[PDB]
């Protein structure tokens, strides 16, 4: 019986390729094939993934060349990647994440060919800089479940940390299959890279901004301060003259000069400070 | 039957333009290559073959390929030029044999010698001994002028396959009729 | 020859050192400028010239010790200046 | 020809994966591969890559192996799934230039008449940037030395795509960053500037030792350049330049004074609101 | 230069090798002397998992080290 705790480890490279491929077939369910190994009864690890030749019609897709797959795979071995197939993935734009209809059928034959298969679904159009939407599933048994048997065993809290969404319940996730938790496990060297990925050259740090143009910006903001001071005086004068929330509620059109006054500070400051400091340093370090 | 990888290292030095063999040594060797590789593939279909050439640099012309035609159409328009350089050729063929597609194959080198070899003997002995411990088998045709190279090669092959290894040969030939006709089919199946 | 602190000089000095009469020297330096081997400007009202850059030349295995000497204690100045700002502002970000 | 080159993150992660994988086929200390890309208006963009078998007998130059008809085969297999991209150049992961790579370049140039080299050093030992770009040229000489075939430098940077930076940021859960505003300026553009400048001067310092008979003066060229460096550096900060400096410092600080004053008045105003509100409601709720 | 191998059954196998040998070779030696196919063998040495393409002196294995064989079972 399958343990509740078993993870899927995906290896950071695979994720980037899944996205850059999904966000291209913009309105179509592009698909691909996924390579890894079964470390253990509590694990599956995916290490790489690659696309295929395929065509579709908006309502469907499928791949057309079967030879290309075996040839590519057998080629890769000559350069240290002997790993084999463990699953497949396809992108759902904007729908959400679930398996539906045909996707179960092409899935289920994998499980007749290789138990412990995994189907992954990603959504590239809801995702945003903070977070990506990924899910990984496997089919519930082909019933004989009137027995009321649980699909899985549990001996940990480790699998009940997350709340299933309404959408997958609509399409029936716990009724026909089950979700499996995604986990990341970066190694040392790639994470050393990943922080360099934004560093910018020393050449720039010591450079001064032009002093002209800079003065122009200073005069621009200082002359912008006036109107805000003038408005601020009235805004101070008139408050508490009416009920408290009816201050804000009547201030949805016209701006409130406090914030616009305040946020022109942090522009005279910061700018003037850093420019004067940088000049003050480099006047010594060169001759 | 046994699966084998074979690299044929043709010779193209200046000396190849002379005329001991009837048309000119170039045509004296091309036919030999044509027969030996037919023998390699027809012996068993998944053996595979590649091509190197020795000049003032070594150069690879076609990596281990299962179809002989690739070699033949390739061997044409090789031109006689420069000076032979033996050691570097054998080294680069060792490299290229490591990267074979199926490690269950064992491997061979064939080379045609057609010029004086300006090598120091004690360098050949080192190369031979390390090749000995790497399980690579070499097999020399003293195709061209037998003299000058008659000794060094023989001592080399001895130090390699010696200690009663027996798997590696030297064979040699005077001027006369075709190599493939009179010579190559004679000593054993090939080599 | 002259140290970079000055590299400024009067008519009389050249006129003697090249033993050519003073009234010619202007044309001489103008020639020098025009062929492009030296750069600067001339300030005739007080008979002075300023020469800010000059053609590089080969030099020997002992002169370069001067280069290494200057560069070494230029180098130490950078580390010294870094210690200060890396220390005094430790609390903003170390 | 080329004025600049832009690299997408997918290439860098690919390089690192290759470097870690090779251990299953050899023991070498370098790996080599092909760059697929495109370009316009002399700005070159590299997007994708695959790695081809290579090998070298370390103890000598001039003895190395590089597999053509695997490269051609893969290039064919890729073209069938993305028509946008074409051979552009090659990369290797060594920390330093090697004697024979000009002789690699003269091979692979047969696949693209303009080919560019990118060094992607996978184990940094400093603050720095992970890539360098090189193009091949012919040099004349004034010494009458024969014409030399040699590399030349090209400026480089990392670029980005909206479909990837979502993934990069989803993965950048490792450490602190974004100490906002004035905090990030001085770190990013004073300290990490000075550390770099110092490392450069140490490098020159070391080279000028070897010329103590350890090595031949490589050219009077390098000495001419050094003399330009020590000649150009700004004039002694001793003349009426000083007056011009004080003027701007006064003007730079005056407006700071003004802004600080504004900053305090608002705090007083907020104070009053807090005070009255408190006491009134207190007495009311009592 | 003697090496001890432990299998799942606990049988001990003795090997005379050299520090510059490769894992492919020792896996083949085991294939010869016991009959196990090479590619089913995985080698374990404390935590590290040994990779075929490189040499014992790279892992600085010493004399009479005890070394574990693990079998990657296959689906059926």
Q: Please list every residue in chain E whose beta carbon sits closer than 8 Å to the beta carbon of residue A115.
A: 75
Q: How far apart (Å, rounded) are the C-alpha atoms in residues E31 and E14? A: 13
Mutate to test the interface with C, among D182, D203, D205 (most CBs of C within 10 A): D205
Residue D38 near residue D159 (C-beta atoms within 8 A): no
| Residue whose entry in the numeric block shows the structure tokens 């996978």 | D122
Residues 26-65, chain C, touching D (beta carbon < 8 A): 53-54, 56-59, 61, 64
Judge whether A90 is annotated as a binding position.
yes
> What six digits make up the tokens of B188?
């054993």
Gap positions in chain A, given as the residue before each gap (C–N > 2.5 A)?
none
CA angle D195, D198, D201 (to 5 degrees): 155
Show residues of chain C in contact with D228, CB under 8 Å. 56
Structure token digits, residue D225: 């350049």
Which uninterrupted H or E stretch holds D135? strand D131-139
Interface of A with D in 176-215 (CB under 8 A): 184, 186-187, 189-202, 204-206, 211, 215
Q: Answer whether D27 sits within 8 Å of E55, measured CB to CB.
A: yes
Quick one: tokens of A207?
């450079």
Q: How many CB pairs under 8 A join A and D?
A: 182
Q: Minimal CA–CA distance to D74: which of A47, A71, B68? A: A71
Cβ neighbours of D23 in E, within 8 Å? 51, 53-54
Show the tokens assigned to D275: 């005070």
Residues in D lying within 8 Å of C, measured between beta carbons = 179, 182-183, 186-187, 190-191, 194-195, 197-198, 201-202, 204-205, 208-209, 211, 217, 220, 223-228, 230-231, 236
Q: Dihedrals φ, ψ of B91, to 5°?
A: -60, -55
Chain A nearest CA to C77, separation (Å): 7
Asked if A285's CB is within 8 angstroms of C78's CB, the reply is yes
Cα separation, D81 vs A51, in Å, equals 8
Residue D240, judged by CB atoms within 10 A of its CB (0-12, 13-18, 19+), counts as exposed
Query: Rounded to an integer, what is the distance from CA B30 to the centroid of its chain?
Result: 12
Residue C54 φ/ψ region, left for φ over 0, alpha for ψ in the -120 to 50 degree band, beta for the rest: beta
| Burial per residue of E58-73, b for 16 or more beta-carbon CB atoms within 10 angstroms, e otherwise | bbebeeeeebebeeee
Residue-range domain boundaries for chain D? 2-182, 223-282
Q: CA of A279 to nearest chain D CA: how many angstroms apart?
A: 10
Distance from chain centroid for Cα A221: 38
Q: How open is the CA angle A25-A31-A35, to the nearest 5 degrees?
A: 135
B65 in D contact zone (CB under 8 Å):
yes
Antiparallel, parallel or unpaired: β D32-40 and C48-54? unpaired
B25 CB contacts (<8 Å, ≥6 apart)? B15, B16, B17, B18, B19, B114, B143, B144
* Residue of A80, A14, A186 whose CA lies nearest to D10: A14
Chain D residues touching B65 at Cβ < 8 A: 69
3-state secondary structure at position E58:
helix
Q: Residue D193 in contact with residue A205, Cβ under 8 Å?
A: yes
Q: Do D22 and E52 touch (CB under 8 A)?
A: no
How was this structure determined? It was done by cryo-EM
Contact pairs from chain A to chain C, CB under 8 Å: 7
* Closest residue to D53, CB basis, from A78, A194, A200: A78
Q: What is the dihedral of CA D227, D229, D230, D234, to 10 degrees?
A: 150
| Crossing angle of helices D241-285 and A271-285, rounded to 10° | 150
Eight-class DSSP state of A3: B
Under DSSP, the state recorded for A210 is: P
Q: Are E27 and E41 in contact (CB under 8 A)?
A: yes
Q: Nearest to residue D55, comparing CAs of D28, D94, D74?
A: D28
Find the distance separating the first CA and the last CA of chain D, reported in whole Å: 83
Cα-flanking dihedrals φ and ψ of residue B69, to 5°? -60, -35
Q: φ, ψ for residue A96 (rounded to 5)?
A: 120, -165
- Facing B95 at nearest CB: one of D57, D68, D69: D57
Residue E52 to residue D24, Cβ atoms within 8 A: yes
Alpha-carbon gap: E36 to the closest alpha carbon of chain A (Å) = 20
Nearest to D184 by CA among A282, A276, A205: A205
Structure-token match 């940037």, residue found: D129
Other CB atoms within 10 Å distance of the CB of residue E35: 7
Classify residue A153 as left (phi > 0), alpha (psi -120 to 50) or beta: beta
Whether D contacts B, i.e. 3 or more CB pairs less than 8 A apart, is: yes
Backbone angles phi, psi at B93, to 5 degrees: -70, -30
C77 contacts in chain A (CB < 8 Å): 284-285
Laid out side by side, the sheet with B58-65 consists of: B58-65, B48-54, B4-11, B106-112, B137-142, B170-172
Query: Two tokens at B43?
Result: 């012996």
Partner-chain residue, chosen from A204, A269, A285, that has the shortest CB–CB distance to D189: A204
Residues 6+ apart with CB under 8 A from A16: D9, D10, D13, D164, D167, D168
Q: Which of residues 57-86 of C touch A (CB under 8 A)?
A: 77-78, 81, 85
Residues of C in contact with A285 (CB under 8 A): 77-78, 81
What residue has token string 């090998």?
D55
DSSP state of A49: E
Say which residues have a Cβ less than 8 Å from residue D221's Cβ, sequence separation at least 6.
Answer: none
- A278-286: list long-range contacts, CB under 8 Å, 24+ apart: A278/A206, A278/A208, A278/D189, A278/D190, A279/A208, A281/A206, A281/C81, A281/C85, A281/D190, A282/A206, A282/A208, A283/D237, A283/D245, A284/C77, A284/C81, A285/A206, A285/C77, A285/C78, A285/C81, A285/D194, A285/D197, A286/D233, A286/D234
Q: What are the CA-CA distances from residue E15 to residues E6, E59, E63 (Å)?
A: 12, 17, 10
- Do residues A13 and D13 lie in contact, with contact meaning Cβ atoms separated by under 8 Å? yes
Alpha carbon distance A98, A168 (integer Å): 6
D102: contact with E, CB 8 A cutoff: no
Between A and E, how many residue pairs show a Cβ–Cβ distance under 8 A? 3
Residue A222 in contact with partner chain C when CB distance is under 8 A? no
A149 is in an annotated binding site: no
Q: Closest Cα partner for A76 from B120, B101, D249, B52?
A: B101
Distance from CA of A270 to the nearest CA of D (A): 6
Q: How far is CA A88 from the centre of its chain?
A: 19
Instruction: Name chain D's partners: 3 or more CB pairs within 8 A.
Output: A, B, C, E
Q: Collapsing DSSP states into helix, strand and coil, what is residue A261? A: helix
Q: Are strands B106-112 and B137-142 parallel, antiparallel or unpaired?
A: parallel
Q: Cβ of A35: how many Cβ atoms within 10 Å?
A: 18
Distance to chain A for D214, nearest Cα, Å: 30
C-beta separation of D36 from D86 below 8 A:
yes
Does residue C93 belong to the interface with chain D, where contact is any CB pair within 8 Å? Answer: yes
Q: Look at strands C48-54 and C8-10 and give their pairing.
A: antiparallel
Give every CB contact of residue D10 below 8 A, 6+ residues apart in sequence: A16, A17, A20, D47, D48, D164
How far, in Å, CA of B115 to CA of B11, rounded?
9
Which residue among B62, B63, B95 sits closest to D55, beta carbon to beta carbon?
B95
Cα–Cα dist A65/A52, whole Å: 8
* Least Cα separation, residue D5 to chain C (angstroms): 32
Query: Closest Cα to residue B70, out of B44, B48, B99, B54?
Result: B48
Of D171, D155, D30, nearest to D93 by C-alpha is D30
| Bridge partners of residue A3, in order along the sequence | A153
* Terminal alpha carbon distance of chain C: 47
What are the C-alpha distances in Å from B53 to residues A232, B8, D13? 88, 9, 38
Q: Which of A206, A281, A282, A283 to mutate to test the interface with C (most CBs of C within 10 A)?
A: A281
Pairing type for strands B48-54 and B58-65 reads: antiparallel
Residue of D nearest to B99 (CA): D53
Chains A and C: 3 or more CB pairs within 8 Å of each other: yes
**Chain B window 114-143: which residues touch D at a Cβ cutoff of 8 Å?**
none
C-alpha span between E52 and D25 (Å, rounded): 7
Give domain limits for chain B: 3-186
SS3 A157: helix
The residue of chain C with its CA nearest to that of A281 is C81
Nearest to D25 among E53, E55, E58 (CB): E53
CA distance D4 to D116: 11
For residue D48, which of D110, D91, D101, D108 has the smallest C-alpha distance?
D91
CB contact under 8 A, C75 and D187: no
Whether D178 and D184 have beta carbons less than 8 Å apart is answered as yes
Cβ–Cβ < 8 Å for A119, A138:
yes
What is the SS3 assignment for C31?
A: helix
Burial of A255 (0-12, 13-18, 19+ CB in 10 A): exposed
Taking the alpha carbons at both ends of chain B, their separation in whole angstroms is 16
At D84, list the tokens.
Answer: 């946008």
Separation CA D128–CA A203 (nearest Å): 11
Contact residues for C24 (Cβ-Cβ < 8 A; gap 6+): none
Q: What does the alpha-carbon distance between residue C28 and residue C22 come to, in Å, rounded to a whole number?
A: 10
Q: Please write down the HEC assignment for all residues of chain B.
A: CCCEEEEEEEECCHHHHCCCCCCCHHHHHHHHHHHHHHHHHHHCCCCEEEEEEECCCEEEEEEEECCCHHHHHHHCCCCCCCCCCHHHHHHHHHHHHHCCCCCCCEEEEEEECCCCCCCCHHHHHHHHHHHHHCCCEEEEEECCCCCCCHHHHHHHHHHHHCCCCCCCCEEECCCCCCHHHHHHCCCCCCC
């Amino acid at each position: 019986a399958v343990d509740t705790a078993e993870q899927v480890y995906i290896s950071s490279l695979a994720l980037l390729k899944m996205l850059k491929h999904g966000r291209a077939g913009v309105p179509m369910e592009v698909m691909g094939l996924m390579l890894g190994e079964f470390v253990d009864d509590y694990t599956v690890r995916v290490i790489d993934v690659f696309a295929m030749p395929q065509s579709g019609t908006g309502v469907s897709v499928e791949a057309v060349d079967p030879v290309f797959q075996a040839k590519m795979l057998d080629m890769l071995k000559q350069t240290g990647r002997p790993e084999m197939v463990v699953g497949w993935y396809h992108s759902h734009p904007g729908f959400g994440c679930w398996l539906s209809g045909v996707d179960i059928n092409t899935q289920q034959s994998f499980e007749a060919l290789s138990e412990r298969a995994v189907a992954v679904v990603v959504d590239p159009i809801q995702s945003v800089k903070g977070k990506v939407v990924i899910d990984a599933f496997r089919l519930i048994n082909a019933n004989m479940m009137v027995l009321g048997h649980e699909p899985r065993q549990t001996t940990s809290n480790l699998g009940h940390l997350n709340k299933p969404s309404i959408q997958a319940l609509i399409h029936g996730l716990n009724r026909h299959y089950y979700s499996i938790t995604i986990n990341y496990r970066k190694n040392e060297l790639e994470q050393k890279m990943l922080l360099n990925l934004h560093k910018k050259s020393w050449m720039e740090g010591l450079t001064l901004q032009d002093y002209s143009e800079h003065c122009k910006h200073n005069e621009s903001v200082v002359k912008e301060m006036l109107e805000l001071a003038k408005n601020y005086n009235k805004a101070v004068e008139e408050e508490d003259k009416m009920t408290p929330e009816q201050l804000a509620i009547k201030n949805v059109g016209k701006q409130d000069p406090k914030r616009h006054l305040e946020e022109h500070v942090d522009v005279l400051m910061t700018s003037n400070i850093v420019q004067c400091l940088a000049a003050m340093l480099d006047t010594v370090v060169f001759k | 039957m046994v699966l084998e990888s074979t690299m044929v290292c043709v010779d193209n030095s200046e000396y190849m333009r002379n005329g001991d063999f009837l048309p000119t040594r170039l045509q004296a060797q091309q036919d030999a290559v044509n027969i030996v590789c037919h023998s390699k593939t027809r012996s068993n279909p998944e053996n595979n073959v590649g091509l190197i050439t020795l000049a003032n640099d070594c150069e690879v012309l076609t990596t281990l390929t299962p179809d002989t035609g690739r070699i033949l159409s390739k061997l044409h328009t090789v031109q006689p030029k420069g000076k032979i350089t033996f050691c570097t050729g054998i080294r680069v063929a060792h490299l290229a044999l490591k990267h074979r597609q199926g490690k269950n194959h064992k491997m061979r080198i064939i080379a045609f010698v057609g010029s004086p070899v300006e090598d120091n003997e004690k360098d050949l002995v080192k190369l031979a001994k390390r090749l000995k411990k790497e399980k690579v088998n070499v097999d020399i045709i003293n195709f061209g002028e037998e003299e000058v190279n008659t000794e060094k090669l023989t001592a080399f092959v001895n130090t390699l396959n010696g200690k009663d290894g027996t798997g590696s040969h030297l064979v040699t030939v005077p001027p006369g009729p075709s190599l493939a006709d009179a010579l190559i089919s004679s000593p054993i199946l090939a080599g | 020859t002259r140290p970079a602190n000055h590299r400024q000089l009067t008519f009389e000095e050249i006129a003697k050192s090249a033993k050519i009469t003073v009234n010619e020297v202007e044309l001489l330096v103008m020639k020098a400028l025009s062929v492009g081997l030296v750069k600067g400007s001339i300030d005739e009202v007080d008979k002075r010239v300023h020469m800010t850059w000059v053609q590089p030349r080969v030099l020997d295995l002992q002169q370069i010790k001067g280069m290494k000497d200057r560069l070494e204690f230029w180098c130490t100045d950078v580390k010294s200046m870094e210690m200060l700002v890396e220390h005094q502002a430790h609390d903003i970000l170390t | 020809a080329v004025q600049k080159v832009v690299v997408h993150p997918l290439v860098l992660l690919s390089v690192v994966d290759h470097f870690n994988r090779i251990g299953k086929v050899g023991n070498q200390k370098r790996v080599v591969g092909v760059l697929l890309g495109s370009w316009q208006k002399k700005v070159l963009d590299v997007s994708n890559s695959f790695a081809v078998p290579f090998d070298e007998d370390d103890k000598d130059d001039s003895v190395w192996f590089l597999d053509h008809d695997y490269l051609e085969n893969m290039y064919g297999m890729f073209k069938k799934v993305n028509a946008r991209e074409r051979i552009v150049g090659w990369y290797h992961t060594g920390p330093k230039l090697h004697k024979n790579d000009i002789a690699i370049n003269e091979l692979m140039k047969r696949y693209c008449p303009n080919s560019v080299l990118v060094i992607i050093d996978v184990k940094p030992k400093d603050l720095g940037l992970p890539t360098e770009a090189y193009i091949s040229v012919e040099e004349v000489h004034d010494d009458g030395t024969p014409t030399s075939k040699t590399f030349e430098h090209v400026t480089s940077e990392i670029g980005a795509e909206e479909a990837e930076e979502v993934g990069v940021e989803h993965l950048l859960r490792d450490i602190k960053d974004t100490t906002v505003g004035t905090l990030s300026q001085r770190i990013t553009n004073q300290v990490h500037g000075l550390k770099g400048l110092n490392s450069k001067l140490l490098d020159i310092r070391s080279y000028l030792e070897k010329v103590a008979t350890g090595k031949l003066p490589i050219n009077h060229q390098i000495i001419y350049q050094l003399q330009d460096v020590f000649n150009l550096l700004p004039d002694v900060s001793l003349q009426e330049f000083v007056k011009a400096f004080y003027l701007k410092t006064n003007d730079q600080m005056v407006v700071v004074y003004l802004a600080s004053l504004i900053r305090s008045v608002v705090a007083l105003h907020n104070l009053i609101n807090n005070k009255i509100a408190n006491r009134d409601a207190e007495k009311k709720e009592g | 230069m003697q090496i001890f191998v432990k299998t799942l059954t606990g049988k001990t196998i003795t090997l005379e090798v050299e520090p510059s040998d490769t894992i492919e070779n020792v896996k083949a030696k085991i294939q010869d002397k016991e009959g196990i196919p090479p590619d089913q063998q995985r080698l374990i040495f404390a935590g590290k998992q040994l990779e075929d393409g490189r040499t014992l002196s790279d892992y600085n294995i010493q004399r009479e080290s005890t070394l574990h064989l693990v079998l990657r079972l296959r689906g059926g």
